[PDB]
Ligand binder design. Sequence first.
Ligand code: HEM
Ligand SMILES: *[C@@H]1O[C@H](CO)[C@@H](O[C@@H]2O[C@H](CO)[C@@H](O[C@H]3O[C@H](CO)[C@@H](O)[C@H](O)[C@@H]3O)[C@H](O)[C@H]2NC(C)=O)[C@H](O)[C@H]1NC(C)=O
Ligand SMILES: *[C@@H]1O[C@H](CO)[C@@H](O[C@@H]2O[C@H](CO)[C@@H](O[C@H]3O[C@H](CO)[C@@H](O)[C@H](O)[C@@H]3O)[C@H](O)[C@H]2NC(C)=O)[C@H](O)[C@H]1NC(C)=O
Ligand SMILES: *[C@@H]1O[C@H](CO)[C@@H](O[C@@H]2O[C@H](CO)[C@@H](O[C@H]3O[C@H](CO)[C@@H](O)[C@H](O)[C@@H]3O)[C@H](O)[C@H]2NC(C)=O)[C@H](O)[C@H]1NC(C)=O
Ligand SMILES: *[C@@H]1O[C@H](CO)[C@@H](O[C@@H]2O[C@H](CO)[C@@H](O)[C@H](O)[C@H]2NC(C)=O)[C@H](O)[C@H]1NC(C)=O
Ligand SMILES: [Ca+2]
Length: 595
Amino acid sequence: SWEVGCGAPVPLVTCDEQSPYRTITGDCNNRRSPALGAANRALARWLPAEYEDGLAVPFGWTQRKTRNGFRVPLAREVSNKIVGYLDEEGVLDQNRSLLFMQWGQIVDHDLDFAPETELGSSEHSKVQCEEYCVQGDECFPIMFPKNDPKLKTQGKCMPFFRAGFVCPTPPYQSLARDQINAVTSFLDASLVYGSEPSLASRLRNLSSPLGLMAVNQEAWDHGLAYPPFNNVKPSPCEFINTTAHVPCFQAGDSRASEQILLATVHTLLLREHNRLARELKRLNPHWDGEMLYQEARKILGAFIQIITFRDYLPIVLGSEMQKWIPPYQGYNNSVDPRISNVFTFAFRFGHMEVPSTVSRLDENYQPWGPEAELPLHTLFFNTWRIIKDGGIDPLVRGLLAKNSKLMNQNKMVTSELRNKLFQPTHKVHGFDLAAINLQRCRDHGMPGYNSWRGFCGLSQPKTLKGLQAVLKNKVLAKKLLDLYKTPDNIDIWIGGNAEPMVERGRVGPLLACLLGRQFQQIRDGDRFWWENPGVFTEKQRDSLQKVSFSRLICDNTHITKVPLHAFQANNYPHDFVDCSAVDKLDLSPWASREN
Ligand code: HEM
Ligand SMILES: *[C@@H]1O[C@H](CO)[C@@H](O[C@@H]2O[C@H](CO)[C@@H](O[C@H]3O[C@H](CO)[C@@H](O)[C@H](O)[C@@H]3O)[C@H](O)[C@H]2NC(C)=O)[C@H](O)[C@H]1NC(C)=O
Ligand SMILES: *[C@@H]1O[C@H](CO)[C@@H](O[C@@H]2O[C@H](CO)[C@@H](O[C@H]3O[C@H](CO)[C@@H](O)[C@H](O)[C@@H]3O)[C@H](O)[C@H]2NC(C)=O)[C@H](O)[C@H]1NC(C)=O
Ligand SMILES: *[C@@H]1O[C@H](CO)[C@@H](O[C@@H]2O[C@H](CO)[C@@H](O[C@H]3O[C@H](CO)[C@@H](O)[C@H](O)[C@@H]3O)[C@H](O)[C@H]2NC(C)=O)[C@H](O)[C@H]1NC(C)=O
Ligand SMILES: *[C@@H]1O[C@H](CO)[C@@H](O[C@@H]2O[C@H](CO)[C@@H](O)[C@H](O)[C@H]2NC(C)=O)[C@H](O)[C@H]1NC(C)=O
Ligand SMILES: [Ca+2]
């Protein structure tokens, strides 16, 4: 093999080994192999990478090269022919709220982030990619096909820059190219606290010994806090409304402001940490700031893990849940907790659950104002609608009363994301998330659809007839092969999401396997998993079984009417109760006595 000790992560950390707290970077979780699960390390490979030249060149780069004898289709063409649709009527999920979609994105951001490349503090190739669509080095443009409306209005391509990779940042050699995971693999609320020393310390309020996270000093939401502003210019959030001058928020994760509902949950989580810390100060007046911070933080990690494994995974995986994630039997230090490369594409099934609009509802859960329902595309990097247009309560009520979009073989990704995506570095609402997902699969060296069907012990369609039976759709199977020519060349993202959903779930057999085994691994490979004896005390876990997202809303917003089961579809007022009926977290178990 090639080097076994390569890398360029945070360099000088050593383990306490008896500390009851996670490190910020993820190091020291596994006592035998400390870097396992740590941030800024390579994404794991469950299968060898597939590149045009076997090392780093993505398939699709060289026009003359083939993949198993055929040309790989253009990402945008696949997007135009398979992924798009016009009519938004009838696409809503009748039994999943909008929060179902939104929590997925939260969990996802806690687990993985492969940042795009850079070496241009004052780059000009950065302009050669955008302006001229010239492929080279880290520019791997998404070219538009014959007859694409965007040709007439946008140019010849979308710019696209390859994902960052380990060891260096330089072109290189050595092993096959591995992309980086800039966040920690453990479900530990790294999206609230950060994955680097550097950022984690800047988010804290070190001006007072109260273990609080810094909040915004310029704006308030009915006496409730907002995240600090990221006062680095030029700002994407300012660009969308030159007049409002409202910057993006600063949170443990850089994508926090990608969309208004995401910014909203990040705010609730930040608020919850501070609520925590205050409650723990009343109970333990003698605790210093560091302990208030760590203890509140530890609690926040457990909430996220509990909501995720108890309420959210069961309804994604359905009947497949117990097949891949059996009851907890304790920590296993032999389990690899790393997020795999393929998981970062499998978890993108969520892109098909995003609806075309976002609503703001008032206290009676009725339209909030004259412009209550807004098109999704005007909410990318939009923080001014939150600070200057109602706060987060109207948005929170939308998350509860509105539905997620249902994955539909004939209607896969709304045009709000497929034609009007706004990328933070560029200036047009004209990008295509789907095409980007397809281009990224290739950038990341992903094996094809049948390689993963085999990995998961599932049949491999070799013929149109076989693909028809697997997809349970004659027309979809046909368009797919008219483009790919063999099921072996189908990009994992489109292939995985084209399969019919398993009973009581929201993903097909393949995705259920990839998702399922990954989640099983981060839970069983986590020394700080909340149920592992010694992490929390018995009385502390009894308190911790009573969480709910509904109650998180009650303690951190002025919404007083919430549903008992926030993830399923809920109708107002029938399924909405008063906050007094939802269980609270009893923190007396955290009361410490000195003598
Ligand atoms: C309107 C909501 C959303 C928007 C605007 C959005 C946008 C984006 C963008 C621009 C990327 C980067 C694509 C690339 O360069 O390869 C991305 C990646 C990703 N998305 Fe979404 N997304 C949304 C919702 C979701 C949902 C609901 C989920 C999961 C249920 C999800 C899962 C992911 C995952 C797992 C990644 C890969 C991150 C990484 O490992 O680097 N997203 N999203
Ligand atoms: C909308 O989705 C709901 C959740 O997916 C679904 O109800 C859930 O059904 C499961 C069984 O399929 C049950 O889960 C657990 O709940 C019972 C409580 O009586 C427990 O005793 C068992 O351990 C069981 O595993 C629940 O009854 C329920 N889950 C929750 C969290 O409420 C609805 O049926 C769906 N609605 C429609 C119209 O299909
Ligand atoms: C870090 O924590 C500090 C201590 O909790 C916090 O200070 C508090 O700041 C708020 C407002 O920023 C003050 O609230 C006061 O606001 C009005 C002013 O318009 C006063 O008239 C009221 O008395 C009200 O209490 C607190 O007084 C102040 N608390 C203390 C003990 O100084 C900082 O704001 C936090 N810093 C960051 C960056 O989040
Ligand atoms: C950019 O952000 C601006 C807000 O920071 C926003 O303008 C604001 O939105 C509307 C006008 O479009 C106004 O709302 C209503 O205000 C009072 C009610 O309190 C009414 O009397 C007005 O008629 C109006 O309907 C806000 O007052 C207005 N604020 C300002 C300073 O203009 C812009 O619409 C945003 N522009 C874009 C392109 O997004
Ligand atoms: C911890 O997980 C490991 C790794 O999955 C288990 O160890 C072995 O794993 C291989 C690969 O699947 C299989 O042979 C068995 O699952 C295990 N081997 C044997 C001989 O048992 C192991 O089951 C787990 N360890 C504990 C203590 O639960
Ligand atoms: Ca994490």
